[PDB]
Amino acid sequence: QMRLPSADVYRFAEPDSEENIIFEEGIPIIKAGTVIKLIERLTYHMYADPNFVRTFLTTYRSFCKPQELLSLIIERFEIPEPEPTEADRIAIENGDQPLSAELKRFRKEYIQPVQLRVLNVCRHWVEHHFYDFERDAYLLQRMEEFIGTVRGKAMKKWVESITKIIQRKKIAHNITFQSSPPTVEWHISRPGHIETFDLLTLHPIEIARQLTLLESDLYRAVQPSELVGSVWTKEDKEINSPNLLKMIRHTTNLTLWFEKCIVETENLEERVAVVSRIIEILQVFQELNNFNGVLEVVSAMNSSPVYRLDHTFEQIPSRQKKILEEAHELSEDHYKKYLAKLRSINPPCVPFFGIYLTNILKTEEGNPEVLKRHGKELINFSKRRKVAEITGEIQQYQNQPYCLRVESDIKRFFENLNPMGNSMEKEFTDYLFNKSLEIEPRNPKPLPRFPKKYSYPLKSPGVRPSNPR
Amino acid sequence: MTEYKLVVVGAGGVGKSALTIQLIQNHFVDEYDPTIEDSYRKQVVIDGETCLLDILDTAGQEEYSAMRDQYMRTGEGFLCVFAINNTKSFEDIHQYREQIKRVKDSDDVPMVLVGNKCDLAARTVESRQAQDLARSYGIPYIETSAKTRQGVEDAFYTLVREIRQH
Amino acid sequence: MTEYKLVVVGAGGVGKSALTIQLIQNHFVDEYDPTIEDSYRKQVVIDGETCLLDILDTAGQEEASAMRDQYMRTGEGFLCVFAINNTKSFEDIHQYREQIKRVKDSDDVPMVLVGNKCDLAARTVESRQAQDLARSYGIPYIETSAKTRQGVEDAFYTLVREIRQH
Numbered sequence: 018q019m020r021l022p023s024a025d026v027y028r029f030a031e032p033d034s035e036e037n038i039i040f041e042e043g044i045p046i047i048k049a050g051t052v053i054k055l056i057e058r059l060t061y062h063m064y065a066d067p068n069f070v071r072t073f074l075t076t077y078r079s080f081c082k083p084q085e086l087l088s089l090i091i092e093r094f095e096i097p098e099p100e101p102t103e104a105d106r107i108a109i110e111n112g113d114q115p116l117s118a119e120l121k122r123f124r125k126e127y128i129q130p131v132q133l134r135v136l137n138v139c140r141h142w143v144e145h146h147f148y149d150f151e152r153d154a155y156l157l158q159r160m161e162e163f164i165g166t167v168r169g170k171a172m173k174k175w176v177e178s179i180t181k182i183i184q185r186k187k188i189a190h191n192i193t194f195q196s197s198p199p200t201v202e203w204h205i206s207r208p209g210h211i212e213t214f215d216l217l218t219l220h221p222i223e224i225a226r227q228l229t230l231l232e233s234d235l236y237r238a239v240q241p242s243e244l245v246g247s248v249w250t251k252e253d254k255e256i257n258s259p260n261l262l263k264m265i266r267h268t269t270n271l272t273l274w275f276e277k278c279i280v281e282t283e284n285l286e287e288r289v290a291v292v293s294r295i296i297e298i299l300q301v302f303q304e305l306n307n308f309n310g311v312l313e314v315v316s317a318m319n320s321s322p323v324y325r326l327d328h329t330f331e332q333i334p335s336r337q338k339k340i341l342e343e344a345h346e347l348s349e350d351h352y353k354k355y356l357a358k359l360r361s362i363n364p365p366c367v368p369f370f371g372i373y374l375t376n377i378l379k380t381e382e383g384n385p386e387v388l389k390r391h392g393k394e395l396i397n398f399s400k401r402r403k404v405a406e407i408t409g410e411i412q413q414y415q416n417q418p419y420c421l422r423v424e425s426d427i428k429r430f431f432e433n434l435n436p437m438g439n440s441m442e443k444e445f446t447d448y449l450f451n452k453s454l455e456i457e458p459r460n461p462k463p464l465p466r467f468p469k470k471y472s473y474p475l476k477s478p479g480v481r482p483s484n485p486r
Numbered sequence: 487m488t489e490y491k492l493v494v495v496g497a498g499g500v501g502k503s504a505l506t507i508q509l510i511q512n513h514f515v516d517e518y519d520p521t522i523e524d525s526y527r528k529q530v531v532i533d534g535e536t537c538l539l540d541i542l543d544t545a546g547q548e549e550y551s552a553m554r555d556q557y558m559r560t561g562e563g564f565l566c567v568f569a570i571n572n573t574k575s576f577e578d579i580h581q582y583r584e585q586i587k588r589v590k591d592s593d594d595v596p597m598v599l600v601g602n603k604c605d606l607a608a609r610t611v612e613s614r615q616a617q618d619l620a621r622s623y624g625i626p627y628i629e630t631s632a633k634t635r636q637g638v639e640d641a642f643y644t645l646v647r648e649i650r651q652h
Numbered sequence: 653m654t655e656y657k658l659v660v661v662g663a664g665g666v667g668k669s670a671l672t673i674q675l676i677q678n679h680f681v682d683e684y685d686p687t688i689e690d691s692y693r694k695q696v697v698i699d700g701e702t703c704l705l706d707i708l709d710t711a712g713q714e715e716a717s718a719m720r721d722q723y724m725r726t727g728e729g730f731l732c733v734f735a736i737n738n739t740k741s742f743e744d745i746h747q748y749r750e751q752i753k754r755v756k757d758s759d760d761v762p763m764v765l766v767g768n769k770c771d772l773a774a775r776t777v778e779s780r781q782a783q784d785l786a787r788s789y790g791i792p793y794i795e796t797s798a799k800t801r802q803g804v805e806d807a808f809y810t811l812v813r814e815i816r817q818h
């Protein structure tokens with residue numbers, strides 16, 4: 018075999034045991050283990066683990082402080098070189114150069130793999146988890162000191178590179194497409210007339226597009242640190258999960274806007290135009306794989322004020338009800354169909370984050386932080402692998418960008434949307450419901466009539482794109 | 487057999503998630519993965535009568551306030567939970583109830599008020615308070631400590647009985 | 653959906669990482685940073701079937717020998733990259749092919765010969781030269797440019813079709 022360093026001069030040489038490391042039942046998968054053992058596997062020398070580094074760097078903060086994580090990998094990096102074999106000694110003692118057969122093998126199979134993987138952890142740590150350094154200046158100096166004193170011509174390539182990445186991170190993403198984006202569609206409102214922009218005056222195709230761009234961005238901005246430790250459900254949610262919340266609020270605001278648009282259009286016929294146009298937007302959303310968008314409409318249609326408007330939905334064409342039903346069925350039975358759908362589309366897409374939040378939360382508090390074996394309290398790594406499996410999935414859908422041209426004025430119209438105004442959730446919500454009672458009263462009270470409110474034609478230009486440019 | 491669609495409502499942080507898990511999961515397995523089908527169904531026997539529980543739980547999705555009505559409409563009975571160490575959550579209950587009455591468009595919707603002990607922090611809502619609130623609504627009151635598996639089954643079965651007797 | 657583990661090999665500097673990030677993010681990396689070991693996941697529909705691609709990015713330097721082998725043991729398909737303006741990278745291919753044949757102990761492993769950086773004008777390897785090497789390996793040859801996206805998808809998806817039909 019190949020002799021490892023002495024466990025008395027290198028802690029990461031201590032043998033595995035049912036007391037410091039548990040394997041799951043074709044690389045090994047760690048179920049539980051000590052911080053020391055966990056870090057040994059994070060940089061093992063036998064095999065590669067595509068997810069270990071990300072899983073670890075994403076979740077370690079609950080069971081290990083940053084300052085200690087660094088000390089430990091530096092400790093792991095400092096592998097003591099093995100004493101000469103008997104042959105080496107014999108040669109040296111005769112004034113000859115030792116062959117060093119084992120020493121060379123020990124470097125090729127243990128030292129290099131280990132040291133390279135420790136540097137890989139340093140590189141990723143600095144690259145995608147820099148906040149750790151932004152909150153601990155000393156932590157950064159130690160890293161710089163460490164990376165900057167790694168001697169040897171071997172590691173130089175990488176050491177040199179990490180040093181640069183670190184600096185680049187203190188000082189302060191373009192996209193290439195095969196085909197170019199489709200032409201921006203305009204309806205009644207013309208370019209540069211933000212005073213007229215509105216649900217029925219903007220092209221429905223373009224409303225779905227600009228909102229899909231807007232929503233895709235909000236999705237791509239959520240960081241894992243806003244999800245680990247169920248921090249978006251705690252008192253400091255505003256501080257720890259600002260991107261997540263910003264994204265969830267946009268969804269809510271748009272849902273409420275749709276609801277407001279529907280119920281404030283008192284005239285039956287005009288309201289049917291309003292509802293129909295929104296279902297058309299839903300249709301484009303589905304085409305663009307904007308599942309988040311699809312659900313905002315569904316939620317609007319299923320809210321208390323809109324759901325009960327039977328006289329309106331009765332007059333909705335047969336084809337559109339079917340569209341809205343398929344859409345609604347997505348969420349039915351715990352999002353069974355939705356999950357199937359998302360697993361099968363060809364991104365770019367904008368998933369619905371609610372599913373992920375619920376899974377992360379249940380996983381977080383349905384699994385112990387540690388598992389005990391013979392008294393020892395091992396870190397429950399399987400619980401972390403599960404949370405990182407989710408953050409990983411989320412990140413996979415964050416890579417693909419939409420080939421759509423942004424239209425500034427339309428983006429702004431939707432960013433400054435504020436259905437609620439100065440009202441509080443309850444007040445606004447009740448206002449919407451009363452409006453529902455006013456436009457379509459409860460039985461046996463008969464349905465009244467209201468005067469039209471729009472002066473422009475209500476005919477939709479449709480959702481099939483035009484091809485002139 | 488009959489299936490009961492039960493909805494667990496309440497402010498974020500009150501432990502709605504732990505309750506659902508404690509009822510559905512296996513208390514004797516090292517690992518739990520809610521990313522596995524039917525971590526919401528459960529076949530149980532209540533008063534000798536067998537039935538299937540379908541827990542519609544959306545913990546973590548509280549901020550998606552405009553999706554609430556949709557999630558609630560499919561429920562047959564509701565668990566209105568609050569934390570005994572959080573007065574806000576307790577004072578919120580009133581609106582959760584009004585919202586349920588609105589989405590189900592009924593005045594008597596089967597429901598149970600649940601006061602949960604999340605941690606070891608100082609209790610700020612006493613039983614009498616909660617008990618009195620429950621009486622005013624004419625619904626049952628059950629205090630649980632999902633963390634110690636106390637009152638959980640009691641809370642859900644009481645709701646199932648509410649639906650039956652309804 | 654099916655999962656496909658693709659491994660990108662070749663001498664350092666040929667562009668293994670640029671091609672990979674161009675595929676994953678539609679972004680071109682202008683700066684150079686030696687890779688150690690990286691993995692990327694990509695959900696894509698190829699020929700009507702939904703795939704889950706696992707792209708393993710490797711380092712081509714000697715210090716990574718042991719490591720690269722470990723990445724090749726688990727891969728099903730291989731992207732063998734060289735740069736059309738670096739003759740040593742084209743001469744290094746032979747070694748990487750042999751390494752793969754040895755690790756996976758097979759003379760029939762799915763792979764594509766990739767001649768990258770075809771957007772540059774200073775070519776030093778002839779298409780015909782590479783084409784002949786590919787034919788002797790019984791695999792396709794695809795020239796690409798991670799900077800312009802030219803041939804990028806072709807290379808990767810062609811590899812997928814070879815793993816599926818294998």
Ligand SMILES: Nc1nc2c(ncn2[C@@H]2O[C@H](COP(=O)(O)OP(=O)(O)O)[C@@H](O)[C@H]2O)c(=O)[nH]1
Pocket residue numbers: 662663664665666667668669670671681682683684685686687768769770771772796797798799800
């Ligand atoms: N012009 C051009 N430069 C490229 C191309 N692919 C890679 N490069 C550059 O070549 C350098 C090395 O790329 P990298 O992806 O790190 O190569 P690797 O060492 O094989 O991983 C970087 O400066 C890249 O920007 C390409 O297709 N065209």
Ligand SMILES: [Mg+2]
Pocket residue numbers: 668669670685686687710
């Ligand atoms: Mg590279």
